[PDB]
Design a protein around this ligand. Structure first.
Ligand SMILES: CO[C@@H](C(=O)N1Cc2[nH]nc(NC(=O)c3ccc(N4CCN(C)CC4)cc3)c2C1)c1ccccc1
Length: 249
């Protein structure tokens, strides 16, 4: 595999170590995303080896709710990732657009996430925290885990981190509790006015439900948002929760 086998289109966005463009596979007239990661920039964040690890993993991850990594290849000073193309953009955007999602869009989104996360839990693969900014939408309005945080400082991250990460397969579940809450309200559960404050809310697990938050919705975010990972439900539970099955699909 090489750069010549692709026709490059318009740039799609910038990353921590490079740009990402929409491209077409010459031999198949196939559309996709070409992500360019500059080796040097990588060598600087002590990720040059880690990245190699994730790419390895994500390359064996085939699931409708996970950004498909078709292939990858390197050269002189940069690295390439043949990525699936999500046409509807990010979930963060669609949310920065509709202010808040309705009970059904919410429930469905959590399901897709729960499913993909399961597919990985079943392959000795786990995920870190999850942000809306890292969720893309497919042609069918389907969510796609697109960050590359798989496993077998930092801005705008604290609000999505769980207790243990500021004080294993349980972080994801905290993420769902946080993603579910935001999805419904419009802002994360422990967002405050200052850094210190935020920290204290996440740490003491201090959050409140706005008037309109259905009660079934309140049972799940609460069972997920446990300071003790041990009590955070299994994905099987989330997937079978009364309110999920009720408004999801
Ligand atoms: C930095 O890496 C990229 C990356 O690897 N990727 C891989 C991959 N595949 N497809 C992508 N599509 C888009 O980024 C995109 C953005 C806006 C867009 N429009 C705006 C809103 N409209 C309503 C519809 C059309 C349509 C598609 C990406 C990004 C990344 C960016 C954001 C989240 C996750 C990953």
């Amino acid at each position: 595999w090489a750069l010549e086998d692709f026709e490059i289109g318009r740039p799609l966005g910038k990353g921590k170590f490079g740009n990402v463009y929409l491209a077409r596979e010459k031999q198949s007239k196939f559309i996709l995303a070409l992500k360019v990661l500059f080796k040097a920039q990588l060598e600087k964040a002590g990720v040059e080896h880690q990245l190699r690890r994730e790419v390895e993993i994500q390359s064996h991850l085939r699931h409708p709710n996970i950004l498909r990594l078709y292939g990858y290849f390197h050269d002189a000073t940069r690295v390439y990732l043949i990525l699936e193309y999500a046409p509807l953009g990010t979930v963060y955007r669609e949310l920065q657009k509709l202010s808040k999602f309705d009970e059904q869009r919410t429930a469905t989104y959590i399901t897709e996430l729960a499913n993909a996360l399961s597919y990985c839990h079943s392959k000795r693969v786990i995920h870190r925290d999850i942000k809306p900014e890292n969720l893309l939408l497919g042609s069918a309005g389907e969510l796609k885990i697109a960050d590359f945080g798989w496993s077998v400082t930092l801005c705008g991250t604290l609000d999505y981190l769980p207790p243990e990460m500021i004080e294993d397969e349980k972080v994801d579940l905290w993420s769902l509790g946080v993603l579910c809450y935001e999805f419904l309200v419009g802002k994360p559960p422990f967002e405050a006015n200052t850094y210190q404050e935020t920290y204290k809310r996440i740490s003491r697990v201090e959050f409140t439900f706005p008037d309109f938050v259905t009660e079934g919705a309140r049972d799940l975010i609460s069972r997920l948002l446990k300071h003790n990972p041990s009590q955070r439900p299994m994905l099987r539970e989330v997937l079978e929760h009364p309110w999920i099955t009720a408004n999801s699909s």
